[PDB]
Motif scaffolding. Structure first.
Motif, mmCIF file in Angstrom:
data_model
loop_
_atom_site.group_PDB
_atom_site.id
_atom_site.type_symbol
_atom_site.label_atom_id
_atom_site.label_comp_id
_atom_site.label_asym_id
_atom_site.label_seq_id
_atom_site.Cartn_x
_atom_site.Cartn_y
_atom_site.Cartn_z
ATOM 1 N N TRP A 1 0.795 -1.218 0.000
ATOM 2 C CA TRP A 1 0.000 0.000 0.000
ATOM 3 C C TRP A 1 0.832 1.275 0.000
ATOM 4 O O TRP A 1 0.265 2.359 -0.169
ATOM 5 N N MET A 2 2.148 1.179 0.186
ATOM 6 C CA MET A 2 3.001 2.353 0.051
ATOM 7 C C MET A 2 3.036 2.904 -1.366
ATOM 8 O O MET A 2 2.979 4.135 -1.509
ATOM 9 N N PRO A 3 3.170 2.101 -2.428
ATOM 10 C CA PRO A 3 3.050 2.690 -3.771
ATOM 11 C C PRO A 3 1.724 3.398 -3.980
ATOM 12 O O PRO A 3 1.698 4.528 -4.482
ATOM 13 N N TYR A 4 0.624 2.784 -3.542
ATOM 14 C CA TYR A 4 -0.699 3.379 -3.694
ATOM 15 C C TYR A 4 -0.762 4.751 -3.036
ATOM 16 O O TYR A 4 -0.978 5.771 -3.703
ATOM 17 N N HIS A 5 -0.564 4.786 -1.716
ATOM 18 C CA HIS A 5 -0.720 6.027 -0.967
ATOM 19 C C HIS A 5 0.341 7.047 -1.349
ATOM 20 O O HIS A 5 0.054 8.244 -1.419
ATOM 21 N N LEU A 6 1.569 6.596 -1.607
ATOM 22 C CA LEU A 6 2.635 7.516 -1.987
ATOM 23 C C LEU A 6 2.326 8.201 -3.311
ATOM 24 O O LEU A 6 2.411 9.430 -3.417
ATOM 25 N N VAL A 7 1.957 7.425 -4.333
ATOM 26 C CA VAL A 7 1.655 8.013 -5.634
ATOM 27 C C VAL A 7 0.432 8.912 -5.540
ATOM 28 O O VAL A 7 0.400 10.005 -6.120
ATOM 29 N N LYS A 8 -0.589 8.478 -4.798
ATOM 30 C CA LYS A 8 -1.802 9.277 -4.673
ATOM 31 C C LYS A 8 -1.526 10.598 -3.960
ATOM 32 O O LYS A 8 -1.977 11.663 -4.403
ATOM 33 N N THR A 9 -0.762 10.554 -2.865
ATOM 34 C CA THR A 9 -0.432 11.770 -2.133
ATOM 35 C C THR A 9 0.453 12.689 -2.961
ATOM 36 O O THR A 9 0.299 13.913 -2.913
ATOM 37 N N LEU A 10 1.386 12.122 -3.729
ATOM 38 C CA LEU A 10 2.210 12.946 -4.607
ATOM 39 C C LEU A 10 1.359 13.624 -5.672
ATOM 40 O O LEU A 10 1.577 14.797 -5.999
ATOM 41 N N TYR A 11 0.379 12.904 -6.221
ATOM 42 C CA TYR A 11 -0.517 13.502 -7.201
ATOM 43 C C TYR A 11 -1.322 14.641 -6.592
ATOM 44 O O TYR A 11 -1.492 15.694 -7.218
ATOM 45 N N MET A 12 -1.836 14.449 -5.374
ATOM 46 C CA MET A 12 -2.562 15.534 -4.716
ATOM 47 C C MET A 12 -1.651 16.727 -4.453
ATOM 48 O O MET A 12 -2.042 17.878 -4.678
ATOM 49 N N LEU A 13 -0.428 16.472 -3.984
ATOM 50 C CA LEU A 13 0.499 17.551 -3.672
ATOM 51 C C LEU A 13 0.992 18.273 -4.914
ATOM 52 O O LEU A 13 1.426 19.422 -4.810
ATOM 53 N N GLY A 14 0.945 17.625 -6.079
ATOM 54 C CA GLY A 14 1.405 18.266 -7.298
ATOM 55 C C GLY A 14 0.649 19.526 -7.656
ATOM 56 O O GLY A 14 1.200 20.397 -8.337
#
Ligand SMILES: CC(C)CCC[C@@H](C)[C@H]1CC[C@H]2[C@@H]3CC=C4C[C@@H](O)CC[C@]4(C)[C@H]3CC[C@]12C
Ligand SMILES: CC(C)CCC[C@@H](C)[C@H]1CC[C@H]2[C@@H]3CC=C4C[C@@H](O)CC[C@]4(C)[C@H]3CC[C@]12C
Lengths: 130, 295, 292, 130
Positions: free
Chosen positions: C234-247
């Motif tokens: 779940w780290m790839p999931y949450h990491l990519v999702k949070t990075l997308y939101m922060l972008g």
């Protein structure tokens, strides 16, 4: 399987109460479904009046006019009381007998989606004049 | 008359009651010790499982009938739901047949009952029962489909015969499947049950002139709940099979359009009773069988 | 193309079978032999089963190039069940870690807390919180022909609870809350408990005592491996999702955003693989599942 | 919320290679996924180049292939290279930005179903001569 013989049609002035009587042989109410169509310029076979178990006598809006459907089981003739001849009614009107589905699975629906594989008959050239 | 929202309300009510009651009867037949679990208990549990699987899809059919026969669930779920109705029918009738045959062994010929219990175990019988139910309902799953019949912008879960038959043989396949379903779900299993029950009644007269009171009382309880289940099945599915068989026979007898329309309009309510049987079973179990009553 | 649906179907089969065997093993033993962690094990298995039963629907969805022939209700239910699996699984891992923390650092306090708070009430509260936390997904999910194609995409509509301007705010808030209560806060609790566990264990691990590692491998290390596998899936999931939101507030280059968008399906794929991976982890380390 | 000040609108003859540059402010490529729309006179606004995520760049099959659309995230200016403009293409051109959903739920798709509830611009009529 059934044999459908159409009638009526022809060159009649607008506003006439033309009656289209599609006879049948072997096409009982509990087996096959009566219906009326007319051939488009691209031979698309647009429906004009179909028999439906859900609705009953489903008329196309663009071909509303004064069309009426009445099925006589005794003489096995479907009547298309297409009164008030419209300029849109200038077409070859064919009747079809798409096999009615069973009561067990389809709830005795009329399977109009299988009109391509249904039995047809050589229609009449309605020429609605003025 | 479509009765407005009567059919979906009934469907949702039987969904709730059947889910709760079938869960309760499964819990009752599974919490008991294996030694106390009799050979009829596996049939009880299998019937409960069939009812549970059917009432799982019951909300889908309630939504179907609520939207004037529109099916917003896809081809796969139409196939699965129809498959599960038919699996419920065959599994329930076969489980009732198994219970009646187990009784016919117990009362009529108890020595032969023990012999057949030794020869044939209950698990093998249940496995064969479910395999036959799956195979016999397989045509429903294979040939079912979703299509906007009558061009009313409404998806209707119907059965397509074009895969295996032409237009001139679609009627033949429809009548064949209907007659086969009627046979192996209400005639042959029921003929087996009536023969078993007739021999059981002869032995019951014999025990009116013989046998032991306490064993007769235990047999009274078990045979009473079993025969009440059989009669409820025979009164909930009889309208279904009767009306559909009459509809098939109408093409041969050339019945008036009034009778055909009456059958067509009354079939949904026969379906209602056939579906209500599943939820009716737990109440019957509580009323007559003390085992579920104790739990 | 067909790799994601094939992996989804393989995970469906393996997860269904493995979670069925896990449930059978945990539910065949006597209540006396059933530890306080067995309820959490069974809840993890139940969540995994509840997700893998809908896994064939998602496999068909991705096979048809993101077309959903199942309906609004089934989109809502399936998304509900993915989110319920996420929260229930991470809450169950939190419960397992907290139970081990109690049993290690303060075993007397472990007995006291077990007496005060039973396992059943903890599990019920866990599942109620998971349901209520995944409620927005069920409420807002819908099916629509996004991008005006024949495909039906199972997305979430914010029109019910927000306007077009506030749709972004609701999306970011839901994503941030899901991350916070599914990875951030639960894992924070787990690392706190594991750090105290590590201190108490190292108090004896400064000596040799290698049998302590096997004793941990019995229960504590299988819980640790479950937590680590959940983290790695779940780290790839949450990491990519949070990075997308922060972008949106860091102004990422288009290449990075495209990379995140293209890699997110595979991160989702690993997050789904975790469900089938868990029973294999049970078989490898814990002999109780291996014996049964 | 994006102020799509679309520029470059003009008028050409048959085969014109007019380039439409829809500028934008606040529509980051991650947040808002912009596209082009064509409103024919007397009818509802249609589509020409709706930039999507699943199909990449999409088009209108009736007019597909005549024009090319590319997006530059640097200056946030969307191109509509309306090449080989035809008299059948004589209409008004609007550029719009629907709010692209997140990767978590919709997989970062452009909610073109919500084109009604989206920001729009002005455009300029392209009277393509015959
Ligand atoms: C509407 C259409 C597009 C949906 C298609 C769904 C199909 C492809 C999926 C959904 C559910 C799936 C099934 C789920 C479970 C099983 C049982 C297993 O022992 C064999 C495979 C089988 C039978 C799967 C085959 C594929 C399947 C039928
Ligand atoms: C695509 C659309 C039309 C399908 C709509 C299906 C709806 C009406 C049906 C299908 C399944 C149903 C649910 C099935 C089970 C339960 C659990 C019960 O404790 C409360 C009711 C509830 C929550 C039902 C509510 C109604 C329900 C959601």
């Amino acid at each position: 399987q059934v044999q459908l013989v159409e009638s009526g049609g022809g060159s009649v002035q607008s506003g006439g109460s033309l009656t289209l009587s599609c006879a049948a042989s072997g096409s009982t109410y509990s087996s096959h479904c009566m219906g009326w169509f007319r051939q488009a310029p691209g031979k698309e076979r647009e429906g004009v009046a179909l028999m439906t178990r859900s609705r009953g006598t489903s008329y196309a809006d663009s071909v509303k006019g004064r069309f009426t459907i009445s099925q006589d089981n005794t003489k096995n003739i479907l009547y298309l009381q297409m009164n008030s001849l419209k300029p849109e009614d200038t077409a070859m009107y064919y009747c079809a007998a798409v096999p009615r589905a069973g009561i067990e699975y389809s709830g005795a629906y009329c399977k109009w989606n299988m009109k391509d594989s249904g039995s047809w008959g050589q229609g009449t050239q309605v020429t609605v004049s003025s | 008359k479509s009765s407005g929202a009567l059919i979906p309300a009934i469907y949702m009510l039987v969904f709730l009651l059947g889910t709760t009651g079938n869960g309760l009867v499964l819990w009752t037949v599974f919490r008991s010790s294996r030694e106390k679990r009799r050979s009829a208990d596996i049939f009880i549990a299998s019937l409960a499982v069939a009812d549970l699987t059917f009432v799982v899809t019951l909300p889908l059919w309630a939504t179907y009938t609520y939207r004037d026969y529109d099916w917003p669930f896809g081809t796969f779920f139409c196939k699965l739901s129809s498959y599960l109705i038919f699996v419920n029918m065959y599994a329930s009738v076969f489980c009732l047949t198994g219970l009646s045959f187990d009784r016919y062994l117990a009362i009529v010929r108890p020595v032969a009952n023990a012999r057949l219990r030794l020869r044939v175990s209950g698990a093998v019988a249940t496995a064969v029962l479910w395999v036959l139910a799956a195979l016999l309902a397989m045509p429903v799953m294979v040939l079912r489909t979703t299509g906007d019949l009558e061009n009313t912008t409404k998806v209707q879960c119907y059965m397509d015969y074009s895969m295996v038959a032409t237009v001139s043989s679609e009627w033949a396949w429809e009548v064949g499947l209907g007659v086969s379903s009627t046979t192996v779900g209400f005639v042959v299993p029921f003929t087996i049950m009536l023969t078993c029950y007739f021999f059981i009644a002869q032995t019951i007269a014999g025990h009116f002139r013989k046998e032991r009171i306490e064993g007769l009382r235990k047999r009274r309880r078990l045979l009473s709940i079993i025969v009440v289940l059989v009669v409820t099945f025979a009164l909930c599915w009889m309208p279904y099979h009767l009306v559909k068989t009459l509809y098939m026979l109408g093409s041969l007898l050339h019945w008036p359009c009034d009778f055909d329309l009456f059958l067509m309009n009354i079939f949904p309510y026969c379906t209602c009773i056939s579906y209500v049987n599943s939820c009716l079973n737990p109440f019957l179990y509580a009323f007559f069988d003390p085992r579920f009553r104790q739990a």
